[PDB]
Design a protein around this ligand. Structure first.
Ligand SMILES: *[C@@H]1O[C@H](CO)[C@@H](O[C@@H]2O[C@H](CO)[C@@H](O)[C@H](O)[C@H]2NC(C)=O)[C@H](O)[C@H]1NC(C)=O
Ligand SMILES: *[C@@H]1O[C@H](CO)[C@@H](O)[C@H](O)[C@H]1NC(C)=O
Lengths: 510, 236, 23, 198
């Protein structure tokens, strides 16, 4: 139903082939910018693989939502040499963490009993809060209806909201009527009931408050020993109530292109205490991509632990992190889930974070594209690309430190491909990337650079425009004018000057 | 691929002017019967046909009549309905014309001592027959080089057959050809032993001309005479 | 590659109410 | 040849479908669609639409080389599933005939004018012979002066043809009884039913 801004979560797609003829099939995830997902604005995360008959295959997709509200997730999949194909866009709810809470207040309106000159001034101070979450939703429905006799109530409703206040009339014609008016900001309310009859006002308010992963301790580790390629999976867990956890469930996703070792899996299956659904075996591999493991109990005492071998088929593409999920029968809202990846400690896929604001990362580092002789037609093909919002030339002022994120501060010089920024050279630019990429980018102070990335990688900052350097934002050394005379360089001096003049002063070929 | 028209047939038999006494459409044939085919002159069945579906090259087929209690008196004759890209190119046989491709004209005829080819040799054509798909080539045998089992008699007259579906495999009458025959069909036909060779792929074809020299002619020929002396003496 | 169907031609399923055709 | 086929769609609206046929050693296909993937050898993916409550048509242009090579898996996938329809194609030479006046009665202890213990059946390739078309010879040994018949009444289990002259006349239906019958008149009159272990 919901996930939250900047959580790492696995969504689990199932693929069904209700046919015969075993099939080879291809499953692409899509790229959507509101997500740090396996996929990138250029290369979609795809897997090709096979599935039996009447048969079914779990495909995990790991993702961190970033922007919140509703956002589309799209999976598509096609069967090799055949009609069969299918896609799915399902919208997904990203919310700010914190829980829903309702505070109701109820005033009586009785101008005859309470008001001054038949005129009753009722005000409701904005109800105090702040077990709240900042800049979160707040929904107050205000709700009057007259009490039944001969009543007649003129009624006023005023908020800072606007100046032109609302006014309702109530009499015997509509005493029993819904007099609702809502506002999405709690603030002092000003009802003025001037009349005679009686009436009920209910101010109903809603907002999010708060105080992940209890119930179970859970380590998960993984790493090699050599045989197509191989590695070891180790899962550790422990209830912590006062007594052994009854009937628990261990949930596992396989890293992309990975399968559980038939042998080992069988070695666990033997038990009056551990059970695994029947599962196909081929070349000593089990055909679950998602293996669930039902056990009879789990100590609150000692770390109960188990392990199995996991093997590879094709080294294909990125290797998507894997999920492990503990949950007790008596507690099926157990959100105790954790990730693993051979070379990722936490297993949480790369992202960059400042404040609330989060953005992608490519996971794979980004090298500063080096090249001596530049093909001007080609280069202009590259830089003249659907997914390239802008091409600047630009001198790198400061290099600064912020939360393991380097901010290479840039000032913009020439504007080749005009960005979306109405005026780049105006306000300085902040090009941010993780420490990990320090040496492979290898920037230096006071050098010039042809940089060109995509708008996709912007990062809403406080009155300073910043991008994040990606396996998609391209930077290059623009040899300085002096350096010009040199041998290592005259050539680049030229190629550039000409590519520059060319792009900056004429569109894109096609 | 040619379906008859049962209805036309019906009338030829059902009526009391019955010309025959029972038409059966049987697995490809239109088998009629009747009491006596005359001798004082002819007797004549007739009926519509159509293209059930499009066929290629349709090999023509059989028409044949005989006496029930004496099939000994048959008489059969072939016939057809109307005579005469890459797939079309069935792999039957393959000539190779350009006198003197140097790639090959000079290469070791390593294909010749290859255990598959039993019979390679020079010979000139003489007769070109062609009936009932049959394209036969009475060739008179010159320079032999390599004898296999069925030793061509040198003076005798071999026969090469391949049918009109082929287009590479087309030889000039009376034009001397080297051939590299991989299929034999030695038929002790009582009096003597004539061999018929087929004309397959993996086979070879080439030509030089006779009568008198011919300028560019003495280039190739160099090689032919060469490998000739080589293997006859003994290249193997 | 080339063993499948063209994304441009695959059209995702996108509409899933729970109750419709209120007529 | 050009194999015709037809796909019918009985259902409400329209419906699309793929018809791909497996190729075989002995049948050129004209396309190099052979595409083998995950153990499977088949044709490109058509992609035809067939109108509502109607019928669409199908062709495969093909030609065979191996004499009498058979059998073609023909498949049709549709938004409902896969049909593997299986056919068998029949292929043939050009002007047929069968010499057979071959035979012997072997009888060791010369109970009939002469002892007979040997016979050679030569190998006669008839000159006008079609090319590349194996000469085919069918061998038969059998029990008594009556064997062939017996074996024909019991064998293939049908009131066999045991002749070759077209079914037309009445005489023809009567013949259908002759073998059965003489086998009987023998089987019974000699008293031989033990013969069958059954
Ligand atoms: C998961 O990882 C760590 C590191 O390998 C473990 O560290 C130890 O924790 C145990 C109790 O859980 C302590 O008693 C040890 O003293 C720790 N190590 C040291 C420095 O002595 C940890 O046990 C793991 N978690 C579980 C609960 O299985
Ligand atoms: C065709 O399919 C059948 C069963 O549907 C299978 O057993 C056979 O091996 C297949 N033959 C060909 C020609 O591909």
């Amino acid at each position: 139903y919901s996930v939250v801004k900047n959580e790492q979560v696995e969504i689990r797609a199932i693929l069904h082939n209700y046919v015969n003829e075993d099939i080879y099939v291809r499953v692409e995830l899509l790229y959507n910018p509101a997500f740090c997902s396996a996929s990138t604005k250029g290369q979609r995360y795809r897997q090709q693989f096979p599935i039996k008959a009447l048969s079914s295959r779990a495909v995990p997709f790991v993702i961190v939502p970033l922007e919140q509200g509703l956002h589309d997730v799209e999976i598509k999949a096609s069967v090799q040499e055949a009609l069969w194909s299918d896609g799915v866009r399902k919208k997904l709810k990203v919310v700010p963490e914190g829980v829903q809470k309702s505070i109701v207040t109820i005033v009586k309106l009785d101008p005859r009993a309470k008001g001054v000159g038949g005129t009753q001034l009722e005000v409701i101070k904005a109800r105090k809060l702040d077990d709240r979450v900042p800049d979160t939703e707040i929904e107050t429905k205000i709700i009057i209806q007259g009490d039944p006799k001969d009543l007649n109530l003129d009624i006023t409703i005023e908020l800072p909201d606007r100046e032109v206040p609302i006014r309702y009339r109530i009499n015997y014609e509509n005493a029993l009527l819904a007099r609702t008016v809502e506002t999405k900001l709690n603030q002092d309310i000003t009802v003025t009931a001037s009349g005679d009859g009686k009436a009920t006002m209910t101010i109903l308010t809603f907002y999010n408050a708060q105080l992940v992963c209890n119930k179970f301790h859970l380590n998960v580790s993984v790493e090699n020993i050599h045989l197509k390629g191989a590695l070891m999976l180790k899962i550790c867990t422990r209830y912590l109530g006062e007594v052994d956890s009854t009937m628990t469930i261990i949930d596992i996703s396989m890293l992309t292109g990975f399968l559980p070792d038939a042998e080992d899996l069988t070695r666990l299956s033997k038990g009056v205490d551990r059970y695994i659904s029947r599962y196909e075996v081929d070349n000593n591999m089990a055909q679950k991509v998602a293996v669930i493991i039902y056990l009879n109990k789990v100590s609150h005492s000692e770390d109960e632990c188990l392990h199995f071998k996991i093997l590879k088929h094709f080294e294909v593409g990125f290797i998507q992190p894997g999920s492990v999920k503990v949950y007790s029968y008596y507690n099926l809202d157990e959100k105790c889930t954790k990730f693993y990846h051979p070379d990722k400690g936490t297993g949480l896929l790369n992202k960059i974070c400042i404040g609330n604001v989060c953005r992608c990362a490519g996971e794979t580092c980004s090298s500063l594209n080096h090249q001596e002789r530049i093909d001007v037609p080609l280069q202009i093909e590259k830089a003249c690309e659907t997914n390239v919002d802008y091409v600047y030339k630009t001198k790198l002022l400061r290099i600064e430190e912020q939360d393991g994120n380097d901010i290479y501060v840039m000032d913009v010089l020439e504007v080749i491909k005009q960005g979306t920024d109405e005026n780049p050279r105006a306000k300085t630019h902040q090009y941010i990337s993780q420490r990990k990429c320090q040496e492979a980018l290898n920037l230096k102070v006071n050098d010039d650079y042809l940089i060109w990335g995509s708008r996709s990688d912007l990062l809403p900052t406080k009155d300073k425009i910043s991008y994040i350097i990606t396996k998609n934002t391209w930077i290059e050394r623009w040899p300085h004018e002096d350096e010009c005379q040199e041998e290592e360089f005259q050539k680049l001096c030229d190629d550039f000057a000409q590519f520059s003049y060319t792009l900056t002063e004429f569109g894109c070929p096609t | 691929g040619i379906s008859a028209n049962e209805e036309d047939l019906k009338a030829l038999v059902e009526g009391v002017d019955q010309l025959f006494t029972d038409y059966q459409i049987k697995d490809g044939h239109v088998i009629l019967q009747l009491n006596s085919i005359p001798s004082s002159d002819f007797l004549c069945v007739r009926f519509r046909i159509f293209e059930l579906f499009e066929v290629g090259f349709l090999s023509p087929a059989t028409f044949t009549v005989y006496e029930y209690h004496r099939p000994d008196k048959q008489c059969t004759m072939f016939y057809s309905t109307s005579n005469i890209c890459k797939c079309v190119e069935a792999d039957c046989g393959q000539m190779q014309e350009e006198l003197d491709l140097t790639i090959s004209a000079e290469t070791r005829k390593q294909t010749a001592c290859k255990p598959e080819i039993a019979y390679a040799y020079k010979v000139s054509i003489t007769s070109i027959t062609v009936e009932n798909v049959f394209v036969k080539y009475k060739a008179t045998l010159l320079d032999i080089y390599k004898t296999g089992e069925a030793v061509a008699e040198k003076d005798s007259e071999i026969t090469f057959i391949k049918k009109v579906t082929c287009t590479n495999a087309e030889l000039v009458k009376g034009r001397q050809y080297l051939i590299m025959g991989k299929e034999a069909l030695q038929i002790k036909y009582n009096f003597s032993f004539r061999y018929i060779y087929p004309l397959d792929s993996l086979t070879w074809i080439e030509y030089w001309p006779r009568d008198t020299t011919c300028s560019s002619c003495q280039a190739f020929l160099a090689n032919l005479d060469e490998f000739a002396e080589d293997i006859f003496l003994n290249g193997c | 590659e080339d063993g499948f169907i063209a994304d441009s031609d695959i059209i995702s399923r996108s509409d899933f109410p729970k109750s419709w055709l209120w007529l | 040849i050009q194999l015709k086929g037809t796909v019918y769609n009985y259902r409400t609206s329209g419906m699309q479908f793929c018809v791909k046929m497996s190729a075989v050693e002995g049948i050129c296909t004209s396309e190099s669609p052979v595409i083998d993937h995950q153990g499977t050898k088949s044709s490109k993916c058509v992609r035809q639409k067939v109108e509502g409550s109607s019928s669409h048509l199908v062709t495969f242009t093909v030609l065979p080389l191996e004499i009498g090579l058979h059998n073609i898996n023909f498949s049709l996938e549709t938004w409902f599933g896969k049909e593997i329809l299986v056919k068998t194609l029949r292929v043939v030479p050009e002007g047929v005939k069968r010499e057979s006046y071959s035979g012997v009665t072997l009888d060791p202890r010369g109970i009939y004018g002469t002892i007979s213990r040997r016979k050679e059946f030569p190998y006669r390739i008839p000159l006008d012979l079609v090319p590349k078309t194996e000469i085919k010879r069918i061998l038969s040994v059998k029990g008594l002066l009556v064997g062939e018949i017996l074996s024909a009444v019991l064998s293939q289990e049908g009131i066999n043809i045991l002749t070759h002259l077209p079914k037309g006349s009445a005489e023809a239906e009567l013949m259908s009884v002759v073998p059965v019958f003489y086998v009987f008149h023998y089987l019974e009159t000699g008293n031989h039913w033990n013969i069958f272990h059954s």
